[PDB]
Design an enzyme around this catalytic site. Structure first.
Site, short mmCIF file in Angstrom:
data_model
loop_
_atom_site.label_atom_id
_atom_site.label_comp_id
_atom_site.label_asym_id
_atom_site.label_seq_id
_atom_site.Cartn_x
_atom_site.Cartn_y
_atom_site.Cartn_z
CD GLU A 163 -3.31 -0.89 1.80
OE1 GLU A 163 -3.29 -0.17 2.82
OE2 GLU A 163 -4.38 -1.53 1.52
CD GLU A 261 -4.17 -5.82 1.69
OE1 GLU A 261 -4.91 -5.16 2.47
OE2 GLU A 261 -2.93 -5.70 1.76
#
Ligand SMILES: *[C@@H]1O[C@H](CO)[C@@H](O[C@@H]2O[C@H](CO)[C@@H](O[C@@H]3O[C@H](CO[C@H]4O[C@H](CO[C@H]5O[C@H](CO)[C@@H](O)[C@H](O)[C@@H]5O[C@H]5O[C@H](CO)[C@@H](O)[C@H](O)[C@@H]5O)[C@@H](O)[C@H](O[C@H]5O[C@H](CO)[C@@H](O)[C@H](O)[C@@H]5O)[C@@H]4O)[C@@H](O)[C@H](O[C@H]4O[C@H](CO)[C@@H](O)[C@H](O)[C@@H]4O[C@H]4O[C@H](CO)[C@@H](O)[C@H](O)[C@@H]4O[C@H]4O[C@H](CO)[C@@H](O)[C@H](O[C@H]5O[C@H](CO)[C@@H](O)[C@H](O[C@H]6O[C@H](CO)[C@@H](O)[C@H](O)[C@H]6O)[C@H]5O)[C@@H]4O)[C@@H]3O)[C@H](O)[C@H]2NC(C)=O)[C@H](O)[C@H]1NC(C)=O
Ligand SMILES: *[C@@H]1O[C@H](CO)[C@@H](O[C@@H]2O[C@H](CO)[C@@H](O[C@@H]3O[C@H](CO[C@H]4O[C@H](CO)[C@@H](O)[C@H](O[C@H]5O[C@H](CO)[C@@H](O)[C@H](O)[C@@H]5O[C@H]5O[C@H](CO)[C@@H](O)[C@H](O)[C@@H]5O)[C@@H]4O)[C@@H](O)[C@H](O[C@H]4O[C@H](CO)[C@@H](O)[C@H](O)[C@@H]4O)[C@@H]3O)[C@H](O)[C@H]2NC(C)=O)[C@H](O)[C@H]1NC(C)=O
Ligand SMILES: *[C@@H]1O[C@H](CO)[C@@H](O[C@@H]2O[C@H](CO)[C@@H](O)[C@H](O)[C@H]2NC(C)=O)[C@H](O)[C@H]1NC(C)=O
Ligand SMILES: *[C@@H]1O[C@H](CO)[C@@H](O)[C@H](O)[C@H]1NC(C)=O
Ligand SMILES: *[C@@H]1O[C@H](CO)[C@@H](O)[C@H](O)[C@H]1NC(C)=O
Length: 986
Positions: A163, A261
């Site tokens: 991320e 995710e």
């Protein structure tokens, strides 16, 4: 990004290819370090494979593998080799995500606490940060490299970083030299599979086309439903993602749409709502609406975070969570698969793996009133010239719990049709979504359309089987193009049920209508047999794959449309195998059930279940109906209150005879901690002295200047920490903590002092872990633990100097328990001595009668502020060979009781931090493997009474879940070292 480096794992705009085969990657997240029982990885892989998934995604936590800078260690419970081996044995591929930064609700977000001593900004190309990561990446990426599919292993994809999606104000972002350095580390260590990233949102960072620092496949994440477990039925306006197909086309149209995710549960903070409430938020309804909404956008790499969460044992978690990492996931922390969301997820995994036409259909814009006259539903088409279309139907208000009646008008190879063609309306009940299909291939047969959803289908040697389902009371219709071959006399045959109707057109398209119910309908059309069931019956069907040969035998004949057997019944079907004329099934049973086997391979005439042969009834369709023995026994486990408890004082520091000559001096006058510049004349930050885990202690010496002095003490332990203070043996006070406090300013009066005499302050500061570092350029992981500031003043205002010593876990980065890792122990006296380890030195403890003034039981506790440690032997003799019996330790939380903190140890592993005044966890599962179900265990409870009245554990019990008769591979006990006297301890 310059194309594939190998030709085993490749990609294009629509999908990955593995060995040249297009596949929908449907993956579940599992973190090996959250389940330190190597022989249970195969259990969780069996449970994920049975969903129809083909992949697992995993993090590696650097903080566990390089607790001492320069000494990478991934041995024993920290080795990945049993995890890789179990993946190969289960027939699962892996997405490896080693960080170095992983976030993951783990302490430091994966960063070892010694990064607090690195001046440069973390997750940038500051060279002290970069070079601090080099040893870990070189080691872990070479371990992963050996496990790549190009070497005969399970790893097919690698994610660098985590991320990497924005930064603090003023900080270069995206930092392409930084991104490329992280990629280069992995390539240099031998990673040749494709690199995929996981942007937190569709921000385009690192996508192909962005030059330096770009990965091969652009991935992003999504947690739309959010984490407000406070209101599990609330699905807020605008929560459904509606832009991802177009965002994908805008950002990376050359690579598969990938959700690296996607929400499978929620984390829960200290003072939270509990994971049962999170599982009610992220439930089966969430899965069918939100996961099919991702199929509406054409996702073809789809990973569910978490699928199995496990446990933050041994202090590995961050302060924003507590011991459990159940996550509300489809597989519980204790590995049970009873939540409805598990069975709903299996319907989706089994559907996608038999539906290759989904991959090359083109997702188009969502519509309203186009594919139905109804405006109360939204339909998203995925369209193809000839290979089949898909239509995802939802309520127009995606949150709606109402029921809608509708019809559809869908394109087909026979033209546009309003369906049902035989009359009646379809039903969409509350928080449901359906996929309808047209020209769907079923082997040699074709469904011209179906409104009912497909669970599975396969071509067996003598028949083709199709399993369709609807929610109860839903009317459904499907039509089969002429299934009779050249025969102009053959006709449909009703085998089971009295509800299905059948009408055949002049061209021999057969149209079947049925209303789903608990009564299965079965119709035979030529050699096609259709089983029509309701959803709750479909939840009990399974599609284990038939093994191939060689090392990769468990991956079966192919990833999509694999050779299989279809089984109706059972809590879990783990696997099937053929040996000679026998079909062998491994299965788990939590309730009695028959097993019905559909699609018997040619030449097979014998059945075995969990190694035991048994007979069967044969149906007119050639299915086998068997009745394996299922006995679910009563289980009795020992009463914890009746164990022989031993006690030891775990705050000997405050006694006048205490010697602290062995303690580290807190005498560093400068710190490299650039995030929290020192306010004190010496550093009192644990990580500056090598202490990164658990509770810290500080001892401050001063000489009294006046009889009354005023002490200001600023402590910091992370959210939900606490701290306690003594002056010599006199209790001064505690900060008792709350969910929202990670630091505290306390003011105390030190009265009745003898001028000129030396006094010692003992300050205990718990740590609930090191913070994450989710925003690059904000070094939040560097938030220290310990004493941020203090001031001691005489009654005339003069400043009084304090000289300090400190400790965390004995040895700091030279930590003492190499087997259990760098974070398991904190700094409390019993931990430093090793008294939490199996077979402790009982002569150092006291034993006396419970409910007596000499009691040594945690149920009686202590009558003053302080810290005691309790140990007891727990023999267990449970039938673990035949049954999976989950065990957990339950604390009674008595509303009116003095506040305390407790630590739970099982055979030396810390398996719980209990905080009586903050919560929410009261039940602490501990896996078989850590517990010995046929031998002696050692159980430890630390009790820290925060108030001067003392504290006790109101009740403490071992709880069992209903035994599951099991076909798993046997669980081996983890051989943690027993107590041995530690040289140099203090
Ligand atoms: C046993 O039993 C028992 C009984 O008997 C129990 O107990 C209990 O418990 C409970 C629980 O714990 C409790 O309750 C709690 O409490 C607490 C405390 O309170 C206290 O205090 C407070 C505060 O104070 C403070 O502040 C203020 C203002 O500021 C002031 O004024 C004061 O003074 C103070 O101050 C100080 O401090 C601070 C801090 O430090 C600072 O700042 C300053 O400066 C200074 O220093 C108060 O307010 C209160 O008050 C109130 O109340 C009282 C009573 O008590 C009264 O008297 C008063 O008057 C008033 O009224 C007290 O005092 C608290 O805090 C809490 O709260 C909560 O809750 C509620 C509901 O229920 C609400 O309302 C509130 O608002 C809050 O909320 C929160 O939380 C919840 C849950 O979780 C949620 O839902 C919400 O939403 C919110 O949230 C937030 O916050 C939190 C914290 O708080 C967190 O955690 C969160 O976050 C997390 O999460 C989320 C999800 O949701 C997420 O999202 C996030 O994330 C993120 O991040 C990440 C990472 O890291 C990333 O990655 C991502 O992206 C993102 O997303 C996370 O983080 C959020 O933020 C409650 O109330 C009670 O008390 C008890 N009771 C008794 C009797 O004791 C127990 O528990 C049991 N046990 C067992 C074992 O079970
Ligand atoms: C052995 O192992 C097996 C697994 O193999 C375990 O079985 C599982 O047990 C769990 C726990 O009990 C079950 O989940 C819970 O299920 C209940 C009951 O509801 C389910 O079954 C009934 C049929 O008996 C269905 O009618 C329900 O479906 C209707 O309601 C749901 C909403 O609840 C809705 O989504 C469906 O679309 C459907 O709606 C239709 O009917 C309703 C009712 O008439 C109608 O109003 C609507 O218009 C539609 O027409 C459902 O499938 C359920 O109440 C529980 O939910 C509540 O709790 C959870 C939080 O835990 C929240 O998420 C949820 O929002 C509710 O508040 C659970 O879902 C599970 O189904 C079951 N699985 C299987 C395979 O059997 C055994 O427990 C294990 N046994 C032991 C001893 O270990
Ligand atoms: C979409 O549907 C949901 C569920 O039917 C609606 O949420 C209800 O909204 C009312 C009025 O605000 C609340 O009183 C209920 O508690 C809600 N129920 C649920 C389960 O949350 C919602 O209002 C609808 N929204 C739109 C935009 O019309
Ligand atoms: C502080 O950083 C310096 C480099 O400038 C390094 O030499 C030193 O070892 C650091 N201190 C600690 C104790 O890690
Ligand atoms: C403690 O007080 C100091 C002022 O000296 C302040 O800067 C800090 O925010 C306070 N911390 C908390 C937790 O209140």
């Amino acid at each position: 990004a310059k194309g594939p480096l190998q030709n085993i794992v490749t990609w294009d705009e629509h999908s990955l290819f593995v060995h040249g085969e297009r596949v929908v990657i449907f993956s579940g997240e599992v973190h090996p370090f959250r389940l330190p029982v190597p022989s249970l990885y195969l259990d969780v892989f069996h449970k994920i494979k049975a969903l129809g998934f083909n992949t697992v995604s995993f993090y590696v936590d650097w903080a566990l593998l390089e607790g001492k800078p320069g000494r990478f260690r991934a041995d024993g419970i920290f080795s990945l080799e049993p995890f890789f081996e179990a993946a190969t044995k289960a027939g699962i591929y892996l997405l490896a995500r080693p960080g170095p930064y992983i976030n993951a609700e783990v302490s430091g977000g994966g960063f070892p606490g010694w990064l607090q001593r690195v001046k440069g900004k973390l997750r940038t190309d500051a060279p002290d940060y970069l070079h601090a990561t080099d040893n870990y990446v070189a080691h872990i990426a070479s371990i992963i490299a050996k496990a790549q599919i190009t070497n005969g292993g399970p790893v097919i994809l690698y994610q660098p970083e985590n991320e990497y999606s924005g930064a603090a104000e003023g900080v270069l972002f995206p930092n392409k030299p930084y991104m490329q350095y992280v990629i280069d580390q992995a390539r240099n260590a031998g990673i040749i599979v494709p690199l995929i990233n996981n942007d937190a949102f569709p921000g385009g960072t690192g996508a192909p086309g962005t030059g330096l620092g770009s990965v091969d496949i652009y991935g992003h994440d999504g947690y739309p439903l959010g984490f407000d477990c406070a209101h599990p039925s609330a699905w807020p306006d605008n929560g459904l993602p509606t832009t991802w197909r177009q965002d994908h086309l805008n950002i990376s149209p050359s690579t598969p749409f990938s959700l690296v995710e996607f929400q499978g549960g929620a984390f829960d903070p200290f003072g939270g709502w509990g994971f049962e409430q999170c599982s009610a938020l992220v439930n089966h309804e969430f899965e069918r609406v939100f996961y099919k909404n991702n199929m509406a956008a054409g996702v073809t790499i789809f990973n569910i975070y978490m699928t199995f969460g496990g446990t933050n044992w041994g202090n590995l978690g961050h302060p924003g969570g507590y011991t459990s990492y159940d996550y509300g996931a489809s597989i519980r922390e204790d590995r049970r698969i009873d939540r409805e969301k598990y069975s709903e997820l299996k319907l989706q995994g089994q559907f996608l793996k038999v539906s290759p036409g989904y991959i090359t259909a083109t997702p188009e814009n969502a519509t309203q009133g186009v594919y139905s006259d109804s405006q109360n539903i939204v339909i998203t088409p995925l369209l193809a010239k000839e290979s089949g279309d898909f239509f995802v139907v939802r309520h127009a208000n995606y949150s709606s719990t109402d029921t809608a009646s509708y019809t559809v008008k869908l394109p087909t190879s026979a033209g546009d049709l309003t369906i049902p063609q035989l009359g009646g309306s379809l039903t969409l009940t509350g928080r449901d979504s359906k996929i309808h299909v047209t020209d769907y291939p079923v082997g040699k047969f074709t469904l011209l359309y179906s409104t009912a959803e497909i669970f599975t289908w396969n071509e067996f040697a003598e028949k083709t089987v199709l399993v369709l389902y609807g929610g109860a009371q839903e009317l459904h219709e499907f039509a089969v193009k002429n299934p009779f071959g050249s025969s102009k006399t053959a006709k449909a045959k009703k085998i089971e049920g009295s509800n299905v109707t059948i009408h055949t057109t002049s061209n021999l398209t057969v149209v079947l209508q049925w209303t789903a119910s608990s009564a299965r309908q079965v119709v035979q059309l030529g050699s096609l047999v259709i089983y029509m069931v309701d959803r709750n019956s479909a939840y009990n069907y399974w599609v284990p794959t038939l093994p191939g040969s060689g090392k990769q035998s468990a991956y079966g004949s192919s990833l999509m449309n694999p050779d299989s057997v279809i089984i109706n019944g059972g809590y879990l079907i783990r696997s099937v195998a053929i040996k000679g004329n026998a079909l062998s099934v491994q299965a788990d049973f939590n309730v009695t059930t028959p097993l019905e086997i559909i699609g018997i391979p040619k030449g097979i005439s014998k059945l075995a279940v969990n190694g035991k042969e048994l007979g069967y009834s044969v149906s007119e369709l050639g299915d086998w109906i068997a009745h394996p023995a299922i006995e679910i026994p009563h289980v009795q486990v020992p009463e914890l209150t009746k164990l022989k408890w031993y006690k030891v004082d775990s705050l000997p520091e405050i006694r006048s005879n205490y010697d602290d000559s062995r303690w580290p001096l807190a005498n560093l006058r400068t710190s490299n901690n650039t995030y929290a510049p020192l306010k004190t004349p010496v550093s009192l930050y644990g990580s500056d002295y090598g202490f990164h885990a658990g509770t810290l202690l500080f001892r401050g010496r001063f000489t009294a200047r006046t009889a009354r002095q005023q002490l200001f003490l600023s402590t910091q332990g992370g959210s939900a920490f606490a701290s306690s203070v003594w002056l010599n043996d006199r209790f001064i006070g505690s900060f008792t903590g709350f969910d929202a406090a990670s630091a505290a300013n306390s003011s105390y009066t030190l009265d009745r002092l003898v001028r000129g005499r030396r006094y010692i302050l003992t300050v205990v500061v718990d740590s609930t872990g090191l913070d994450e570092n989710w925003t690059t350029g904000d070094d939040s992981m560097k938030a220290p633990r310990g004493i941020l500031d203090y001031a001691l003043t005489s009654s005339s205002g003069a400043n009084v100097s304090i000289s300090w010593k400190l400790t965390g876990n004995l040895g700091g980065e030279d930590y003492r328990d190499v087997f259990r890792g760098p974070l398991n122990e904190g700094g409390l006296f019993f931990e430093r001595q090793g008294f939490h380890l199996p077979s402790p030195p009982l002569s150092d403890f006291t034993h006396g009668p419970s409910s007596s003034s000499s009691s040594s039981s945690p149920l009686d506790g202590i009558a003053h502020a302080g810290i005691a440690f309790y140990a007891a032997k727990l023999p267990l003799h449970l039938p673990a060979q035949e049954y999976d019996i989950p065990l957990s330790f339950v604390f009674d939380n008595a509303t009116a009781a003095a506040p305390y903190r407790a630590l739970l140890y099982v055979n030396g592993f810390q398996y719980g931090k209990y905080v009586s005044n903050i919560g929410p966890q009261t039940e602490f599962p501990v896996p078989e493997g850590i517990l010995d179900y046929n031998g002696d265990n050692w159980i430890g409870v630390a009790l820290w009474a925060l108030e001067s009245r003392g504290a006790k554990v109101p009740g403490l019990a071992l709880k069992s879940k209903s035994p599951i008769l099991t076909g798993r591979e046997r669980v081996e006990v983890v051989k943690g070292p027993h107590f041995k006297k530690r040289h140099g301890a203090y």
